Swiss-Prot record, chain E:
Highest taxon listed in the record's lineage: Viruses
Subunit: Interacts with capsid protein VP0 and capsid protein VP1 to form heterotrimeric protomers. Five protomers subsequently associate to form pentamers which serve as building blocks for the capsid. Interacts with capsid protein VP4 in the mature capsid. Interacts with protein 2C; this interaction may be important for virion morphogenesis.
Subcellular compartments: Virion; Host cytoplasm
Protein purpose: Forms an icosahedral capsid of pseudo T=3 symmetry with capsid proteins VP2 and VP3. The capsid is 300 Angstroms in diameter, composed of 60 copies of each capsid protein and enclosing the viral positive strand RNA genome.
UniProt name for this protein: Capsid protein VP3
Source organism: Poliovirus type 3 (strains P3/Leon/37 and P3/Leon 12A[1]B)
Length: 62, 266, 279, 4, 117, 266, 279, 62, 135, 4
């Protein structure tokens, strides 16, 4: 049941994809460490809550 | 085609229609249109009441006057509407009630008048109090209904320990809640800039940590209207224009019917 | 791949497209970029927002409590042979401010306990190594009146048995909220005054407060019987939210906190003096 | 195992 | 944001000077750097993008000449003109936000909140 | 579609952007957009310098004030720009230089103000002088740089033979050059009619009898701004509004590099 | 396989090829071998340069700091109840000289902390085991004024909680530079004096210095409340660069260091006396 | 996700390729040990920075 | 005695350049300090030995062999681009490895002329001109 | 696994 994934390598030694392994030891998911592979989203719901969302080059108020 | 515009709107709900010839598009709070509780998000098991057109319509609250000294106004929802026709009745006859809303704020003037109103819709709008005493504001004072409340320019502490006012003391630049007003724009908002628009239209979903809750014990949304830029006209130092707030419930549903709740507002 | 959008080589302009102009009244923020208002080159962007994810922002153990407990001869007056602490992030200010950037949150909670001890009195002989018992008492369960009474039997309450000198104690707690999310702010009351009430205290409540005991308490004691000489000890509690999700953004606290609600008292002047035309 |  | 009356007109120069020279005291000097000439009209507001122009790959959040960002300044390009029976004086509001290329790193504790014993 | 207009423009050159919400379309002088010297029209053989964004950007000249007595203003190009950042440096370090330009003239007022500015772009704008003496205007007086020059309502002859002013005497209705102003419209132009527009935008090609020439010895274009209709407001006899000229070099290329030219403007 | 080039069996010579002759004026070094100037046999070479790789050369934990911290009764005067150290490799000379063989470097950094303690005074009773808190304070973050003030709440700053007697504390740090490489030398200034300046101090700076706080500080304290008797302690910090890359070679420091820059003061006579024709 | 490679055997016991195993436990590559399988390069950029690099048997200056 | 105290004005001689010295004569006057460099020749003016400067890009003008030296230089820095006004990327050091000598005339003297050309020059962040104080 |  081992989980394997790619590290995002920053400073590369003079030696390419490097991996790390993770295994959960506990039944309760709350006991788990943080995966930290977090997806993002649009600012839109906050930066443009508009019913008619308009194109940046056209007049804001028409 | 034909000649349509971002500034000319018609809102029609139930037997009520609003027209605006000078709007600034419209905001849908957090990108979510109001909706009913889904079966997979449901929690009270009893069949709900959905009054549709008899409760989901435009109630116009008592008008407030904006003048040169005006510091700000605030209302809470559903509290502002507790006495609004069949909505208020449904709200007090049931333990549980959810609602979305369309808020339409009205302020007109002239090409020669000047000023900018900040219309803010806030989730869980907790205000600060009177006293040394923490979390001491009374239910009666926390809930002004239709009348709403006002902001102040500075913190004048309610000093009399013997017979305390148990009121809020909302300081404008601290949004009445301990943070700075300039950042209130992270909340769903519009600006009534008098050279640009007569009004603001914010549509609101039900926001809460539960699918449904007690409307009588808890306000979901707060409406804050603070003048970002003061009212000014010609050279007449005591200028004064009306601000009218019109609100409509949306997708209202009620659970847990029993005898009517009669709160003490005294 | 998680890098940010590349910059576009943009050129001169003479058009009827005016992106530089907008109307903030509408409620929206102009989605502009350098290439809209100035000539830009093509930059291949490698920068990423990996540290500012909701998880990475909270991924740190924060001190939320210092529980002081003594081990000494049980005399006949007020003492600290055992202590109790209402679990909360509000006794401290730092994590409180980060979680309060949001209205609602849902997460699992990690608790790490740093125990430290020392000798109170110059010298009455010494002490053999102390074992500490941290018991979680959920609301409803019996609270201890005595350091060695029956509640510490702990048959169903979770308890930690920590040994001094060992690596700091650590446990995880699931999302335990009565709702679909923890409310960082509650614009309401737990009771409502009705006209028909006898006294006007019946329906009275603390504004913005929900449950009375909210999540319960942690009770702490030294399981060791008392030495001749006294040992004072401190259980430092570190809190870390993991598997975190957050809703509805709020402005950061700009004035010093005054209790559990949003109440302010003083130092309401957060901003410095700086001249309008001064750099 | 499970390789992503 | 121009919060003046609709009868008020005007043209404004708003600028950004990348670091290294004398901070601008005159429109003439400000002209020379990154700038927008805002014309007041039905579109109430104007956006100036301060473009990421820097020597280091990341600047610091505290003050430091080595990683300094430069200067922002504003001037009348013409002047505010009103007619009669119109207020001759009005407010301008300013707003700030980050563009989509913006990032931050090395999480830390803020100086903007504290606690006494 | 969307809502675009003849009156709303954005000009972006280098690190500079101009916005106008009330323009009157834009003129491209003689139908020709600025361009670089083609290999088959080339004459100096040395590799040219092309500074692009560092010289081809919007330089704003010192503002002039239009008032009820204002007779007119005039500038010469490249002279107006001789001290404008890296453009002026490139101009004085090289024997040869060509340039096109975007001229943007700024004059705003109010729906209650009145008046019409004639903005004229003239090829080879030779002006008349002071004296009995023919073709006697000095280089220093012919070239005011950024400051520009002014027109006059009548010919007042520089009378002192002993110590002559060696200046120009530009009479407005004679376009300062011996012909009538009403015909200046055969030249590339726009009108700033205050009830219609805040501004004028003329794009200029390099015009000359050579592919390239000495910018220090010779001006290619002249900018003449004469009030066709006087400034008027309400009833206030001493009305005064600013006119701001913003110019940008275009497709600038330089030949014949050597040591810097230091002219005597004294 | 990583062994060095084999030696070639080379023989007698009578030719117009003269490899023994060259011209060092050109800037180059003659690529010669024994087989060019003498008769050689065939040697199969097994020797390798494995220990002199950039990684192997730096792959060792070097002492760069000794942070002294006490745990004693908080009296009312200057004390060491907590300490702060500006992170650097320059307080020490040894690693400083190795990293300075190069102009630019890029690496990840490993920190290992050896904590040691002892009794100051002949005898006031004893002390129970001490727990140490090492907090990294990045530039901008609030610096502690008191050993038990709010900054130690550490909600977002990285902190280590070390227990005396345990294996030495250890952590890794990524390449945290504001540039594509750490500069071991900076021929420049952080500010430039302009003619238009009011005083001539406005634009004044330390030569070769870049950021004021460069990487921040490590703050150290004993989390334990004071015993009657005092305990003095030393946190020794070992630094090791890993996943190392280096650019532009420089000559080694030949005279004793005099501060952070290249400044020299004394012992400018590095070479011994030896006769020209003496072996 | 286990990494396996050959040790360079120095003193051989009286018993051939011997291997060692490595596994990364952490997501952040900075946390990793040093691989130490480092490749080399030419002295050339330093020992002969010349525009016309010449052959050792021909006259250095022609 | 002061560390990293050399002033911008003294660090940057422009075209005039600077000179090396044979020994370390310390600027003694605390009251009004010269804030200058003291570059000692055999220590390359920087604390290391001159014989090792050959690890750096170099040529030798040996008068019996050549009139000149031509070194082509890339932009070297820890950043793609930086402030040229705040920071020098390259330094040119010319030290006589072997002294000038002629016939038997003890006061011989020949000219050394340095000619430099910029290459692949590119500029970012235009604004008003920087006027440094070289006084 | 990954064998080099
Ligand atoms: C309403 C505001 O407060 C919060 O949002 C908030 C505050 C505290 C939170 O912690 C979860 C509650 C408890 C539940 C269980 N708990 C335990 C359980 C066992 C042990 C040994 N120690 N602690 C301690 C924490 C979670 C959320
Ligand atoms: C400019 C010259 O200096 C250097 O090149 C150089 C000097 C020091 C360097 O170390 C990296 C900086 C810091 C960053 C973070 N850090 C930490 C972080 C957390 C903890 C617990 N302890 N230490 C300590 C070191 C890296 C490079
Ligand atoms: C999936 O995990 C199968 C492979 C397991 C490999 C051996 C793991 C040894 C450690 C087992 C941990 C048990 C923890 C409760
Ligand atoms: C790839 O690694 C799959 C094989 C894993 C074999 C079992 C490894 C047991 C140790 C797991 C380490 C987890 C570290 C976070």
């Amino acid at each position: 049941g081992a989980q394997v994934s790619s590290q995002k390598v920053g400073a590369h030694e003079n030696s390419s994809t490097i991996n790390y392994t993770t295994i959960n030891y506990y039944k309760d998911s709350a006991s788990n460490a943080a995966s930290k592979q977090d997806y993002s989203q649009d600012p839109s719901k906050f930066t443009e809550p508009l019913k008619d969302v308009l194109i940046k080059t056209a007049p804001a108020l028409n | 085609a034909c000649g349509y515009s971002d500034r000319v709107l018609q809102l029609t709900l139930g037997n009520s229609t609003i027209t605006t010839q000078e709007a600034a598009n419209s905001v849908v709070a957090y990108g979510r249109w109001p909706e009913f509780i889904r079966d997979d998000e449901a929690n009270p098991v009893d069949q709900p009441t959905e009054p549709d057109v008899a409760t989901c319509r435009f109630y116009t609250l008592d008008t407030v006057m904006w003048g040169k000294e005006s510091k700000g106004w605030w209302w809470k929802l559903p509290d502002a509407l507790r006495d609004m026709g069949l909505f208020g009745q449904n709200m007090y006859y049931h333990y549980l009630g959810r609602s979305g809303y369309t808020v339409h704020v009205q302020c007109n003037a002239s090409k020669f008048h000047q000023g900018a109103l900040g219309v803010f819709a806030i989730p869980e709008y907790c205000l600060a109090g009177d006293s040394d005493k923490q979390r001491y504001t009374s239910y009666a004072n926390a809930n002004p209904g239709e009348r709403g409340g006002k902001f102040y320019s500075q913190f004048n502490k309610d000093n009399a320990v013997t017979s305390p006012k148990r009121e809020f003391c909302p300081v404008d630049y601290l949004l009445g809640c301990g943070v700075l007003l300039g950042n209130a724009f992270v909340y769903p908002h519009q600006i009534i800039n008098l050279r640009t628009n007569n009004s603001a239209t914010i549509v609101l979903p039900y926001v809460n940590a539960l699918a449904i809750d007690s409307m009588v014990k808890h306000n979901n949304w707060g409406i804050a209207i603070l003048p970002l830029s003061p009212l000014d006209f010609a050279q007449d130092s005591s200028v004064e224009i009306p601000i009218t707030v019109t609100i409509a419930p949306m997708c209202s549903e009620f659970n847990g019917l029993r005898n009517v709740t009669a709160p003490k507002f005294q | 791949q998680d890098s940010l959008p590349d910059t576009k080589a943009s050129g001169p302009a003479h058009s009827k497209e005016v992106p530089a102009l907008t109307a903030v009244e509408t409620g929206a923020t102009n989605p502009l970029a350098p290439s809209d208002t100035v000539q830009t080159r093509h930059v291949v962007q490698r920068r990423s927002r990996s540290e500012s994810t909701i998880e990475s922002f909270f991924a740190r153990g924060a001190c939320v409590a210092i529980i002081e407990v003594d081990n000494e001869q049980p005399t006949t007056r007020a003492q600290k042979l055992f202590a109790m602490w209402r679990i909360t992030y509000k006794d401290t200010v730092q994590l409180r401010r980060k979680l309060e950037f949001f209205t609602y949150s849902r997460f699992d909670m990690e608790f790490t306990f740093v125990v430290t001890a020392n000798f109170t009195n110059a010298n009455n002989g010494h002490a053999l190594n102390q074992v500490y018992q941290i018991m979680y008492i959920p609301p409803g369960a019996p609270t201890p009146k005595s350091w060695d009474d029956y509640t510490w039997q702990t048959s169903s309450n979770p308890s930690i048995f920590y040994t001094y000198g060992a690596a700091p104690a650590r446990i995880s707690v699931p999302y335990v909220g009565l709702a679909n999310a923890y409310s960082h702010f509650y614009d309401g009351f737990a009771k409502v005054p009705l006209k028909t009430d006898a006294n006007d205290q019946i329906g009275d409540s603390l504004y913005s407060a929900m449950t009375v005991d909210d999540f319960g308490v942690l009770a702490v004691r030294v399981v060791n019987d008392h030495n001749p000489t006294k040992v004072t000890s401190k259980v430092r509690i570190y809190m870390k939210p993991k598997h975190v999700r957050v809703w509805c953004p709020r402005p950061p606290r700009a004035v010093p906190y005054y209790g559990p609600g949003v109440d302010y008292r003083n130092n309401l002047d957060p901003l410095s003096e700086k001249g309008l035309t001064t750099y | 195992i499970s390789e992503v | 944001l121009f919060c003046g009356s609709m009868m008020a007109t005007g043209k404004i120069l708003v600028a950004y000077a990348p670091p290294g020279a004398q901070p601008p005291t005159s429109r003439k000097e400000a002209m020379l750097g990154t700038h927008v000439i805002w014309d007041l009209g039905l579109q109430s507001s104007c956006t100036m993008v301060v473009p990421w122009i820097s020597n280091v790959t990341y600047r610091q959040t505290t003050q430091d000449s080595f990683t300094e960002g430069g200067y922002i300044s504003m001037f009348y390009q013409t002047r505010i003109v009103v007619p009669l029976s119109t207020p001759k004086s009005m407010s301008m509001l300013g707003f700030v936000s980050a563009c989509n290329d913006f990032s931050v790193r090395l999480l830390r504790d803020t100086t903007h909140i504290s606690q006494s014993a």
